[PDB]
């Protein structure tokens, strides 16, 4: 576990970042795959939260990988890493032409076939309804195609890097997916499956009839993006471009800038209702134009087609979470010459989008200052009428916990830092005035909740509890006196601490550039967080920083039942039997050979939470980048033991 950093007082944040960078990139540490250089979720394999295995990769991890190299370039002058990062990304996690066969057959007038979402995984599979549901049109596909070709240039969210699930050939990296079955399907209640479905495993129809009930079943591929990964990546490329041109080295990143621009154009797919229904309809009214556009970054876009015969479909998402917005990236593609969309309409849509997102944050801001969850255009996932007294935002209903309820998707304080960091960069770069009150109220709140201790430790909010509703959006912030957030627990999360330090340093930099004076308190708090995360969680084996966490939730390894429909039967690539009655561990039987299996299992027997040490990729990067931000805007600042 953790031991104190030996670091000398007066070490520059530049030098600290260079130390952490070195450790993240050292092949002996094992942050990246040995064969292809893909960044794993974490060094440890036994870990369950969003991904359910440590040696998956996620598009998230890649976005952080790009961010890290951007900062490296800034501090160092060597830009090759940014190119390498983006190469690995397109070689592996972006589906190429050969992996989206006959996407060319996609029809904008009939994007997809409607299906309900339900409040429990037991209700699934969900029935596809070519019957009685007319679906809206896709107003974006044509001008995307016209600029780019038939294919989708987005990152699929999840990939099994060393094929630990077995769905793939030999040891190759394989697209996989998990979440399918509505709001009550946590990480613990899923059935992992390949994205390219060849019936090679599972039941007779592979895994399909587990999730979506069709009249007939055929071999198909499907993908899902998590747009916050794309936002982060393009955001990183903006900085890579800016910093590189300052050095007279813009040519080293021009191709990546171009790819990032394209990527940004495609994120437009994330702006529409799941089935292109009218925003605010409270009904399954198909939409014709941009009437289906909420103009926010929804939870996903997903698309697929047949492997055999050629056909295709695409969905947006009706659900929107504040934690997924990126008004900064929005603003980059809307206004910045080098990131101008090739499409004829992208610049205009993005211009609408970023402003629209900036209003979202404002609408969601509780009376205390933290940002509430979000909003939906399809109540209970089936476009029902909104309950009486439901406050709205351009027609969408307020939801405290968009998409997931176990745990509620806005319980995690991490989103506050992640999401408002972007708003800070936006204020840094525009001096936009309309956003000043949002930012200050949020900073005030966060400053009131950070705990510093005289022994040099720290604590930050971990879990949030929400009550009430925002007032209905009128174009203007009311103060939401009846929307409340309460911090219910605190911890020592290293990525979240890095992320929040970034936000405070960036904000501080922004007050210097645009306001009467530098916000000295925000700047100093950024430095405290970084000092304390590094001093207190240093890894003496040289792997960077390292967490120590009681994972009570790990009892679900052995206690959680995974719904399988009665009568359904099938097998994982290693024989593990998929049938009604199974627990998490039953379909992930290889876990028993994990170095940390004994430890978590013995803690199960004795009825106690096991204690884990984790080096997550993104924890290390969020901390490193925070250091790099201090190095960039406050180059005289200098580490000291806290
Ligand atoms: O016409 C010719 C042939 O057509 C066939 O019929 C087609 C039909 O035309 C077409 O409409 C249909 O497409 C549907 C698919 O069947 C179905 O798979 C798809 O389901 C979606 C589902 O609606 C959606 O909610 C779900 O989203 C998941 C997502 O996959 C998952 O990745 C995501 O996880 C996120 C985590 O929550 C988050 O924490 C993490 O950070 O990021 C992740 C997001 O990146 O969670 C979401 C939900 O929360 O995805 C699935 C797809 O994966 O819906 C389509 C339309 O309804 O396909 C049919 C074929 O199957 C006929 O079969 C044939 O006869 C004809 O010849």
Coordinates of N, CA and C in Angstrom, one line a residue, residues 304-388:
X304 N -24.9 -0.3 -35.1 CA -24.5 -1.7 -35.5 C -25.2 -2.1 -36.8
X305 N -24.8 -3.2 -37.3 CA -25.4 -3.9 -38.5 C -25.1 -5.3 -38.5
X306 N -25.8 -6.0 -39.5 CA -25.6 -7.4 -39.8 C -24.2 -7.8 -40.2
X307 N -23.8 -9.0 -39.9 CA -22.5 -9.6 -40.4 C -22.7 -10.3 -41.7
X308 N -23.7 -11.1 -41.8 CA -24.2 -11.8 -43.0 C -24.7 -10.8 -44.1
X309 N -26.0 -10.7 -44.2 CA -26.7 -9.7 -45.1 C -26.4 -8.3 -44.6
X310 N -26.4 -7.3 -45.5 CA -26.1 -5.9 -45.2 C -27.3 -5.0 -44.8
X311 N -27.4 -4.7 -43.5 CA -28.3 -3.7 -43.0 C -27.7 -3.0 -41.8
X312 N -28.3 -1.9 -41.3 CA -27.7 -1.1 -40.2 C -28.7 -0.2 -39.5
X313 N -28.3 0.2 -38.2 CA -29.1 1.0 -37.3 C -28.2 1.9 -36.5
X314 N -28.8 3.0 -35.9 CA -28.1 3.9 -35.1 C -29.1 4.5 -34.1
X315 N -28.6 4.6 -32.8 CA -29.4 5.3 -31.8 C -28.6 6.4 -31.2
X316 N -29.3 7.4 -30.7 CA -28.8 8.4 -29.8 C -29.1 8.0 -28.4
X317 N -29.4 8.9 -27.5 CA -29.8 8.6 -26.2 C -30.6 9.7 -25.7
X318 N -31.6 9.3 -24.9 CA -32.6 10.3 -24.4 C -32.2 10.8 -23.1
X319 N -31.2 10.2 -22.5 CA -30.8 10.6 -21.1 C -29.5 11.4 -21.1
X320 N -29.4 12.4 -20.3 CA -28.3 13.4 -20.2 C -27.9 13.7 -18.8
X321 N -26.6 13.6 -18.6 CA -26.0 13.7 -17.3 C -25.0 14.9 -17.4
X322 N -25.0 15.8 -16.4 CA -24.2 16.9 -16.4 C -22.7 16.5 -16.4
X323 N -22.4 15.4 -15.8 CA -21.0 14.9 -15.7 C -20.4 14.5 -17.1
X324 N -21.2 14.5 -18.1 CA -20.8 14.1 -19.5 C -20.7 15.3 -20.4
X325 N -21.1 16.4 -19.9 CA -21.0 17.6 -20.8 C -19.6 18.1 -20.9
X326 N -19.3 18.7 -22.1 CA -17.9 19.3 -22.3 C -18.0 20.5 -23.1
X327 N -18.5 21.6 -22.5 CA -18.7 22.9 -23.2 C -17.4 23.4 -23.8
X328 N -16.3 23.0 -23.2 CA -15.0 23.4 -23.7 C -14.7 22.8 -25.1
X329 N -14.8 21.5 -25.2 CA -14.7 20.8 -26.5 C -15.7 21.2 -27.5
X330 N -16.9 21.4 -27.0 CA -18.0 22.0 -27.8 C -17.5 23.3 -28.4
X331 N -17.0 24.2 -27.6 CA -16.5 25.5 -28.0 C -15.3 25.4 -29.0
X332 N -14.4 24.4 -28.8 CA -13.3 24.2 -29.7 C -13.8 23.8 -31.1
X333 N -14.7 22.9 -31.2 CA -15.1 22.6 -32.6 C -16.0 23.7 -33.2
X334 N -16.8 24.4 -32.4 CA -17.6 25.5 -32.8 C -16.8 26.7 -33.4
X335 N -15.7 27.1 -32.8 CA -15.0 28.4 -33.0 C -13.6 28.3 -33.5
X336 N -12.9 27.2 -33.3 CA -11.5 27.2 -33.5 C -11.2 26.6 -34.9
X337 N -10.5 27.5 -35.7 CA -10.1 27.2 -37.1 C -9.6 25.8 -37.3
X338 N -8.6 25.4 -36.6 CA -7.9 24.1 -36.8 C -8.9 22.9 -36.6
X339 N -9.9 23.1 -35.8 CA -10.8 22.1 -35.4 C -12.2 22.2 -36.1
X340 N -12.2 23.1 -37.2 CA -13.4 23.2 -38.0 C -13.8 21.9 -38.6
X341 N -15.1 21.5 -38.3 CA -15.7 20.3 -38.9 C -15.6 20.3 -40.4
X342 N -15.2 19.3 -41.1 CA -15.3 19.1 -42.5 C -16.8 19.2 -43.0
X343 N -17.7 18.7 -42.2 CA -19.1 18.7 -42.6 C -19.6 20.1 -42.8
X344 N -20.7 20.3 -43.6 CA -21.2 21.7 -43.8 C -22.0 22.3 -42.7
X345 N -22.5 21.4 -41.8 CA -23.3 21.9 -40.7 C -22.8 21.8 -39.3
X346 N -21.6 21.1 -39.1 CA -21.0 20.8 -37.9 C -20.7 22.1 -37.0
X347 N -20.1 23.1 -37.6 CA -19.8 24.3 -36.9 C -21.0 24.9 -36.3
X348 N -22.1 25.0 -37.1 CA -23.4 25.5 -36.6 C -24.0 24.8 -35.4
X349 N -24.0 23.4 -35.6 CA -24.6 22.6 -34.5 C -23.8 22.7 -33.2
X350 N -22.5 22.6 -33.4 CA -21.6 22.8 -32.2 C -21.8 24.1 -31.5
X351 N -21.9 25.2 -32.3 CA -22.2 26.5 -31.8 C -23.5 26.5 -30.9
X352 N -24.5 25.7 -31.4 CA -25.7 25.6 -30.6 C -25.4 24.8 -29.4
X353 N -24.7 23.7 -29.6 CA -24.5 22.7 -28.5 C -23.7 23.3 -27.3
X354 N -22.6 23.9 -27.5 CA -21.8 24.4 -26.3 C -22.6 25.4 -25.5
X355 N -23.3 26.3 -26.2 CA -24.1 27.3 -25.4 C -25.2 26.5 -24.7
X356 N -25.8 25.5 -25.3 CA -26.9 24.8 -24.7 C -26.4 24.1 -23.5
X357 N -25.2 23.5 -23.6 CA -24.6 22.8 -22.5 C -24.3 23.8 -21.3
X358 N -23.7 24.9 -21.6 CA -23.5 25.9 -20.6 C -24.8 26.3 -19.8
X359 N -25.9 26.3 -20.5 CA -27.2 26.6 -19.8 C -27.6 25.4 -18.8
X360 N -27.2 24.2 -19.3 CA -27.5 22.9 -18.5 C -26.9 23.0 -17.1
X361 N -25.6 23.3 -17.0 CA -24.9 23.4 -15.8 C -25.6 24.4 -14.9
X362 N -26.0 25.6 -15.5 CA -26.6 26.7 -14.7 C -27.9 26.2 -14.1
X363 N -28.8 25.5 -15.0 CA -30.1 25.0 -14.6 C -30.0 24.1 -13.4
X364 N -29.0 23.2 -13.5 CA -28.8 22.1 -12.5 C -28.1 22.5 -11.2
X365 N -27.7 23.8 -11.1 CA -26.9 24.2 -9.9 C -27.7 24.4 -8.6
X366 N -27.5 23.5 -7.7 CA -28.2 23.5 -6.4 C -28.0 24.8 -5.7
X367 N -28.9 25.0 -4.7 CA -28.7 26.2 -3.8 C -27.4 26.3 -3.1
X368 N -26.8 25.1 -2.8 CA -25.5 25.1 -2.2 C -24.3 25.3 -3.2
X369 N -24.5 24.8 -4.4 CA -23.5 25.0 -5.4 C -23.1 23.8 -6.4
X370 N -23.2 22.6 -5.8 CA -23.0 21.4 -6.6 C -24.0 21.2 -7.7
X371 N -23.6 20.5 -8.8 CA -24.4 20.4 -10.0 C -25.2 19.1 -9.9
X372 N -26.6 19.2 -10.0 CA -27.5 18.1 -10.0 C -27.4 17.2 -11.2
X373 N -28.0 16.1 -11.2 CA -27.7 15.0 -12.2 C -27.9 15.4 -13.7
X374 N -29.2 15.7 -14.0 CA -29.5 15.9 -15.4 C -31.0 15.9 -15.8
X375 N -31.2 15.2 -16.9 CA -32.5 15.3 -17.5 C -32.7 14.2 -18.6
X376 N -34.0 14.0 -18.9 CA -34.4 13.0 -19.8 C -35.5 13.4 -20.7
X377 N -35.4 13.0 -22.0 CA -36.5 13.1 -22.9 C -37.5 11.9 -23.0
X378 N -37.2 10.8 -22.3 CA -38.0 9.6 -22.3 C -38.2 9.1 -20.9
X379 N -39.2 9.6 -20.2 CA -39.5 9.2 -18.8 C -39.7 7.7 -18.6
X380 N -39.1 7.1 -17.6 CA -39.0 5.7 -17.4 C -38.5 4.9 -18.6
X381 N -37.9 5.6 -19.5 CA -37.3 5.0 -20.7 C -38.2 4.6 -21.8
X382 N -39.5 5.0 -21.6 CA -40.6 4.6 -22.5 C -41.4 5.8 -23.0
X383 N -40.8 7.0 -22.9 CA -41.5 8.2 -23.3 C -42.8 8.4 -22.6
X384 N -42.9 8.2 -21.3 CA -44.2 8.4 -20.6 C -44.4 9.9 -20.3
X385 N -45.6 10.3 -19.9 CA -45.9 11.6 -19.4 C -45.1 11.8 -18.2
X386 N -44.6 13.1 -18.0 CA -43.9 13.4 -16.8 C -44.8 13.5 -15.7
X387 N -44.4 13.0 -14.5 CA -45.2 13.3 -13.3 C -45.6 14.7 -13.1
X388 N -46.7 15.0 -12.4 CA -47.1 16.4 -12.2 C -46.0 17.1 -11.4

